[PDB]
């Protein structure tokens, strides 16, 4: 599944026993309800530029 | 940077400037509040260890402005595999003396996972590379920070598409031009090589090295950085060692 389309993550895909797939994000991220998504826990996360963010 | 523009005030906010004695060494790339990742052929030429300094937030090199955070270098960790004086292996991981904080000015990219840097990043055609290094070959050095952006080449095409010429490992990738017009140089040494995907930003490569500044019938040599996930998680995991200089066995 995480070979194709990054299996439907935004940033990191697990594959498991089976057509199972989890999803993760990176340290100063969580992962949505949708199971694919990934939000800032952190004012600062990592590869995000402030100035365009707030814009 | 050759044929690249000015990267606005805050817009690459996790290049970091590398100086030895005050003087301009090379770049690199902040993935963490105290961990720093560049070039193994940066130091080759280093004796002065204890003079090594990273500054964050920086952006124009005459003036102070407030922003730039300077930290001098604890560590610097090198592969065993790499060879001063030649390109295979050229990584670096250097640890800061003390974190840096967190600000606008001053944000870590993101250290991929290597399933998702092979098997989705690596596929991404486009990516930024920039530094302080010249803005033409046999030029001088820029004053303020410049970005490009430049397409990724299959290593296949790589070696078709270009004209005692060294080989591209697994431990490397080829991106840019070909034409003469768009470049990293040598003083963008140690740079991030950063790639864009669903709304955030990740080290794809290192400015590594080329035949010359900008030449044409030339790519750009980049360290693939999805080789060294593992071996770079590992040692930021580990204790700090006394001396400034440490080679770490590769893989
Ligand atoms: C991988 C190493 C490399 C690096 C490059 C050229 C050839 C080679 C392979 C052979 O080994 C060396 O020459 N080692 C070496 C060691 C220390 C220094 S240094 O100056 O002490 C350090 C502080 C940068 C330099 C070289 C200076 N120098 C020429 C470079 O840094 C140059 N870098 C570079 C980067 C991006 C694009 C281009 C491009 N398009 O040409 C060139
Ligand atoms: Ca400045």
């Given at each position: 599944?995480?070979?194709?389309?990054?299996?439907?993550?935004?940033?990191?895909?697990?594959?498991?026993?089976?057509?199972?797939?989890?999803?993760?994000?990176?340290?100063?991220?969580?992962?949505?309800?949708?199971?694919?998504?990934?939000?800032?826990t952190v004012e600062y996360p990592c590869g995000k530029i402030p100035i365009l963010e707030?814009? | 940077?050759?044929?690249?523009?000015?990267?606005?005030?805050?817009?690459?906010?996790?290049?970091?400037?590398?100086?030895?004695?005050?003087?301009?060494?090379?770049?690199?790339?902040?993935?963490?509040?105290?961990?720093?990742?560049?070039?193994?052929?940066?130091?080759?030429?280093?004796?002065?260890?204890?003079?090594?300094?990273?500054?964050?937030?920086?952006?124009?090199?005459?003036?102070?402005?407030?922003?730039?955070?300077?930290?001098?270098?604890?560590?610097?960790?090198?592969?065993?595999?790499?060879?001063?004086?030649?390109?295979?292996?050229?990584?670096?991981?250097?640890?800061?003396?003390?974190?840096?904080?967190?600000?606008?000015?001053?944000?870590?990219?993101?250290?991929?996972?290597?399933?998702f840097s092979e098997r989705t990043l690596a596929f991404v055609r486009f990516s930024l590379?920039?530094?302080?290094?010249?803005?033409?070959?046999?030029?001088?050095?820029?004053?303020?920070?410049?970005?490009?952006?430049?397409?990724?080449?299959?290593?296949?095409?790589?070696?078709?598409?270009?004209?005692?010429?060294?080989?591209?490992?697994?431990?490397?990738?080829?991106?840019?031009?070909?034409?003469?017009?768009?470049?990293?140089?040598?003083?963008?040494?140690?740079?991030?090589?950063?790639?864009?995907?669903?709304?955030?930003?990740?080290?794809?490569?290192?400015?590594?090295?080329?035949?010359?500044?900008?030449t044409v019938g030339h790519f750009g040599v980049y360290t693939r950085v999805s080789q060294?996930?593992?071996?770079?998680?590992?040692?930021?995991?580990?204790?700090?060692?006394?001396?400034?200089?440490?080679?770490?066995?590769?893989?």
């Amino acid at each position: 599944i995480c070979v194709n389309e990054n299996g439907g993550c935004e940033q990191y895909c697990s594959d498991h026993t089976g057509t199972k797939r989890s999803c993760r994000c990176h340290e100063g991220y969580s992962l949505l309800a949708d199971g694919v998504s990934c939000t800032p826990t952190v004012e600062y996360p990592c590869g995000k530029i402030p100035i365009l963010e707030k814009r | 940077i050759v044929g690249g523009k000015v990267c606005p005030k805050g817009e690459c906010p996790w290049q970091v400037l590398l100086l030895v004695n005050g003087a301009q060494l090379c770049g690199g790339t902040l993935i963490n509040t105290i961990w720093v990742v560049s070039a193994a052929h940066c130091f080759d030429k280093i004796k002065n260890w204890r003079n090594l300094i990273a500054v964050l937030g920086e952006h124009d090199l005459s003036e102070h402005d407030g922003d730039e955070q300077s930290r001098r270098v604890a560590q610097v960790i090198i592969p065993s595999t790499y060879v001063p004086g030649t390109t295979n292996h050229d990584i670096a991981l250097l640890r800061l003396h003390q974190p840096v904080v967190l600000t606008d000015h001053v944000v870590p990219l993101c250290l991929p996972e290597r399933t998702f840097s092979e098997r989705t990043l690596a596929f991404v055609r486009f990516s930024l590379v920039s530094g302080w290094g010249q803005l033409l070959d046999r030029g001088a050095t820029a004053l303020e920070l410049m970005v490009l952006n430049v397409p990724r080449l299959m290593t296949q095409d790589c070696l078709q598409q270009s004209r005692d010429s060294p080989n591209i490992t697994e431990y490397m990738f080829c991106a840019g031009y070909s034409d003469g017009s768009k470049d990293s140089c040598k003083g963008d040494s140690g740079g991030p090589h950063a790639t864009h995907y669903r709304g955030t930003w990740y080290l794809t490569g290192i400015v590594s090295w080329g035949q010359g500044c900008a030449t044409v019938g030339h790519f750009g040599v980049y360290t693939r950085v999805s080789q060294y996930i593992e071996w770079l998680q590992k040692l930021m995991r580990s204790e700090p060692r006394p001396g400034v200089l440490l080679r770490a066995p590769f893989p």
